[PDB]
Amino acid sequence: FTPLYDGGDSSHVHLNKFSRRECIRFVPKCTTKHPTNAYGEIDFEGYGGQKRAPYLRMSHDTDANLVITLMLKRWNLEIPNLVISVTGGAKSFVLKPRLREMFRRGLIKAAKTTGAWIITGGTNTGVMKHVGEAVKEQQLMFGSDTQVNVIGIATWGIVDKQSDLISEKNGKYPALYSMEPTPGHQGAMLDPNHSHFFLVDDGTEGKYGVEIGMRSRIEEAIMKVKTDSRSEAGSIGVPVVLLVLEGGPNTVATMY
Amino acid sequence: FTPLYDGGDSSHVHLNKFSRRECIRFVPKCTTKHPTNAYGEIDFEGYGGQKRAPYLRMSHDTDANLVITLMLKRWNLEIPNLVISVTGGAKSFVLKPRLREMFRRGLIKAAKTTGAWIITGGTNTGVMKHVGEAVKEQQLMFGSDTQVNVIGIATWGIVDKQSDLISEKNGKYPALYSMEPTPGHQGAMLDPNHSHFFLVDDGTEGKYGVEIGMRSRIEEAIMKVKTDSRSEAGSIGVPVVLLVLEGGPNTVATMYELIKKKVPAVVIDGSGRAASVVGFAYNHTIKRNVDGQTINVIDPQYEDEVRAKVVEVFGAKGADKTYSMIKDVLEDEKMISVYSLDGEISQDIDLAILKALLKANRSSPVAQLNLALAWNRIDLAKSDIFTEEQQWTTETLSAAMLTALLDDKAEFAELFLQNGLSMREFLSLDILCKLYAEVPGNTTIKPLLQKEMGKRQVKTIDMDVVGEVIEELMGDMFESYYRKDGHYFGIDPLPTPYLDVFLWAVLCNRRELARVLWEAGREPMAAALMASRLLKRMASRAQEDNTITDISSDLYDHARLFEERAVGVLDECFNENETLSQTLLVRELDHYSRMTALELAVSAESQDFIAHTSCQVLLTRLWMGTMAMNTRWWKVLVCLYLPVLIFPIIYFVPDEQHERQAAEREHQKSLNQDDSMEVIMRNKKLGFCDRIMHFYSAPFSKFVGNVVGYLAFIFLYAYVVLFNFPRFDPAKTLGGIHPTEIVLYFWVFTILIEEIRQLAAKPPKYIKDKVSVYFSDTWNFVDIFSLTVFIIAIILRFFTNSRIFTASRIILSLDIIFFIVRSLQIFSVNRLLGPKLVMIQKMMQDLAQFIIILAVFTIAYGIALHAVMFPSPGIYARNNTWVTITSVVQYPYWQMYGELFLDEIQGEKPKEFGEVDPDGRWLSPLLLAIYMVFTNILLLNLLIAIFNYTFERVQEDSDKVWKFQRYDLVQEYHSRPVFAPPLVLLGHILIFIRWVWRTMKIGLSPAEMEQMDNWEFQAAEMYIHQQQQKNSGTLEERVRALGDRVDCINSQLNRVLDSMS
Amino acid sequence: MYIHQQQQKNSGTLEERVRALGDRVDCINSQLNRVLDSMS
Ligand SMILES: *[C@@H]1O[C@H](CO)[C@@H](O[C@@H]2O[C@H](CO)[C@@H](O)[C@H](O)[C@H]2NC(C)=O)[C@H](O)[C@H]1NC(C)=O
Ligand SMILES: CC(C)CCC[C@@H](C)[C@H]1CC[C@H]2[C@@H]3CC=C4C[C@@H](O)CC[C@]4(C)[C@H]3CC[C@]12C
Ligand SMILES: [Ca+2]
């Protein structure tokens, strides 16, 4: 009925922590941009804890400033002091256990102490899996009090179980994304351990190099957002850093 | 004579732990198979402990299935989860002390943790000696609690002291096998450290290769025995593993023989001949000549001659055939395995043995997981079952999960949940019914389920039975959702999978499994309180019943653990936000029969939960029902009788909350340029007429009213008793009765009605159960006694007769005591007086014991005193029985308090007291003096010592008891009639009109209920991880972990020193 | 004098000595791992 009384400006944990912009969706395949069908949250099937990861499908021609507006205002995501872009191999690879342990200690310690975002490919294979597993067995060990924000910028033409995430109406905020792959798709699934998802549409399906443009244009957009502080001299532009594990010539092109 | 009584199915260690089959014996030497002479036990001559090792001689043509039947049934040997076959050198050999120590740590650790048999040659030389010595100085160090079964399969023609073991008759079970060898036999003795012996006959003597056939045929026989488990999917075939230390070509033949029967082999390098050759043959390189599912043949152009010469180091006659057998064993990469001392740091020999079996089942991961479950070793599951390489789903982990649940493998169930098992998909109705169908037998729930389905004649268990058992274990009109919800009768998944599996876990009394399932749940606080209720109620059920075994202290201890968890979650919720935690306590929970967390914490008598600050502040807020927090008693007292002052001077909850919100909106500016619970816990507003009824509906206003009305009653009743209570005469008007007494009848009738409606409004819905719970607290005895006594007095009053009128007025004039002493309940709302009134009733026991001892001394002295003063017949004999009986009790009693009758008990006062006997005149003060020592300066001072002793102990607990009783106080006055003491009886009628027409909680929205569940769950996570970090950071655990890291440093430096040398 | 005495009091507690001892043992273990890497 009426709003329940919480002692505002007295205690820390309020219940707020626990109808949209343009958001075009190319769904014709030549292209007719409609309003999006997929923008709720994902309850992954029983990997420990109660963690709803909000997501959104969007066209490849969407301006990055609106995505920053969506993250900061609409999703209630805090302004970061650092952004770690993890690029590398798409296919799964092996790390030596010492270096693996050192990697998943380093990345999460940097993210937790700094208060940073970690931007990754989003899918369940390659370097994205290592970042996901790092987040998993660092939150299973110490709990989720300082939540590390992992952003998965993936493509919509590859992700499995599309019909699971689709709904013409508003109110898709409960969604039940299963882990059993559909037989004979030839395309990856979403990572269970990531916190937020950006799914790039192109109309097409089974094409890998769709999210390369949006990744860069978002990474441009969070280099001109100013950090939060009381002083007007302390408000610096958000620094971005790039981290490399593997890849072909394409990662070296992205690096340069 | 008859069987001695041991408490079966109650305690663990029974005295059973502390006339045969065919059993042929070839004893002719051509062969005539007779019944065996040698099958008792062997007491080895003084090697420490009392260990009888049973043995049996048998022919070489005996079928292995009968030997398995003999082991499992006749010898009472448990079905193993692993079999380690140790082959090697027959003659004695030397191990390097590090490798020796590592060997005897590894073999016994594998055997103890897995629960395995170790099959060996049996004799006292070679590898058998190393296995024997390993067992000896691992049982001398840690004792024999987990007994390792070592089986010695030896030959009868070689063993010494045969005449010692032989007896034609039955009963050879005491035997004394000495260690001094017989001079000039040329044949080994038995090993002292082995547990069981199989001695193979052939008729012949002095022949070694007799036991080779039986060894293999037994090893065949225990590959088709199924392992013991509750699930029919968990019963795997027993895995066998082979371990090699040394040998000639014969061990390599045996190795290649058993590989073809799908038995893997572990070869120990850093030892003797055949192991080092096969090991260094394996140690070169890797090479797949053909695909062939990963085959190896390590023989390039480079390193053939090195293997040729190393084979030629020992044995020239047939170097090619033994080299062929050495290259044959290295065919399958999966089967053969080689342990070297310079391989890794963190790999011991037990890991090599078990990982060799996991390597042997490399094709199917399900078989590997079943082996990992069967052994109960989760480190292997973490190591090489659940890796990054392979993925697990619900469909693949279903059988493993069900096996993990039914066999009490809590850590595996935890691990399956947090890897790839989702209980929404896993748990169907049939699985849940299967879980309740396979309850152990030694639990408390099994009799209860049997008794419930015993009546109403139902042969198959279903959730209606389980629901009814859960209903009768929570007596306050609880309603389990199994009885009503459509999902639990007989596809979409079940509503609450974690909850009902958690309920199954707590009803079976499984501590670790219940903890695992509690941590992954939606309402931790409510579940913990329901758990503690279930545990302690079934504890009392187990205690008071003869046909259920007493495991009550275990169940109370488990209930106490869940009570601590509930308080811990509340404490963390309180530390995060103090207001919403109090909202959390009054949530109307749908899965717990519309019952709130505070009611659950009262149902199970959880004083630590109710005594917590959050509950106490909540109770004070409920006491101030829809009224400002700092409204004083006198302000209420004025407004109670002058309802025109109700609006100006009484502040309310909306007013103070509006003020706080209006202030906090301004603080954010820059410095430069029946709906009482709702209006308490929402942003609702009160008009004019609403905040009149809300003032009168508050518990505190009803309490102030009750106090004023009670004072009026006591003064009125004191007046009539002291001043004006005449006798009934029909001549005068009204019987000459003053109106005062009619007003007294009116108020006592009001108190009678109050007690009737206090009886009628109890939690159970059975008049016997209402009465039984109504007489739980001791005030209601005094209430019904005083009311009954009053009604009897007023009935006796009217009859107009001096004797029974005297009885009437005396009965009223004594009933004043009980009505005034009843005031102490209205005094007990105070913070300071309340605990003191609890302390008094706890001291009544010590007062009772004191009075008993005092009464014994009083009566002794009394009888002696009266007998001496007044002789029994005679001149001084007082001729009256009643005064004698009363005087014996009377005068000793008053003499305690300093009323010494010194003039009376001596000669003086002949008229008042009575004339005393001349010899009593001097006896009486002497007896008095002795009595005064033992009464005044011994017992009374001892009573002071007793009270001071018990006051500190009672001080600690009486406060909690007062804290807990505040709920009943608030709940009582919450339900009282709305109107004031003068008209309170008129108010009472409105409850009768509501009843003839035919509460402290709030209903939240689905969105809010979701938000509150999420916040509660995160608070529980904070508690769980803080407790883990508290238990890990203890000084002893830091020193222990520091010791482990120092051992790792020492091992690394040893490898550096090996790398130098 | 008061400030530094309080720092030296809080540092010299038994639990803090054991914790710091644990950190130095971890440093020794890491150094030996690098020695073993230098061997291999
Ligand atoms: C109690 O009764 C006895 C027996 O009747 C009385 O004892 C007698 O008292 C008279 C008068 O003093 C003596 O002459 C007798 O010798 C007494 N009898 C005996 C057997 O010795 C006694 O007086 C009575 N006591 C009281 C107090 O009334
Ligand atoms: C406190 C210590 C010294 C013990 C005292 C015991 C006294 C009080 C006891 C013991 C013996 C008793 C005395 C025994 C004999 C007599 C003679 C005569 O007059 C009657 C009472 C009288 C006088 C007694 C009075 C009390 C008495 C004196
Ligand atoms: Ca009552």
Curated annotation (Swiss-Prot), chain A:
It is found in: Cell membrane. It comes from the Eukaryota. Belongs to the transient receptor (TC 1.A.4) family. LTrpC subfamily. TRPM2 sub-subfamily. The Nudix hydrolase domain is dispensable for ADP-ribose-dependent channel activation. May be involved in the regulation of ADP-ribose intracellular levels. Essential to prevent response to oxidative stress. Nonselective, voltage-independent cation channel that mediates Ca(2+) and to a lesser extent Na(+) influx, leading to increased cytoplasmic Ca(2+) levels. Functions as a ligand-gated ion channel. Binding of ADP-ribose causes a conformation change; the channel is primed but still requires Ca(2+) binding to trigger channel opening. May have ADP-ribose pyrophosphatase activity which reduces ADP-ribose levels induced by oxidative stress, thus preventing the channel activation by reactive oxygen species. Homotetramer. This is Transient receptor potential cation channel subfamily M member-like 2. The chain holds residues 6 to 312 of 1551 of the full protein.
Swiss-Prot record, chain C:
It comes from the Eukaryota. Residues 14-39 form a coiled coil. It is found in: Cell membrane. The Nudix hydrolase domain is dispensable for ADP-ribose-dependent channel activation. May be involved in the regulation of ADP-ribose intracellular levels. Essential to prevent response to oxidative stress. Nonselective, voltage-independent cation channel that mediates Ca(2+) and to a lesser extent Na(+) influx, leading to increased cytoplasmic Ca(2+) levels. Functions as a ligand-gated ion channel. Binding of ADP-ribose causes a conformation change; the channel is primed but still requires Ca(2+) binding to trigger channel opening. May have ADP-ribose pyrophosphatase activity which reduces ADP-ribose levels induced by oxidative stress, thus preventing the channel activation by reactive oxygen species. Belongs to the transient receptor (TC 1.A.4) family. LTrpC subfamily. TRPM2 sub-subfamily. Homotetramer. This is Transient receptor potential cation channel subfamily M member-like 2. The gene is TRPM2.
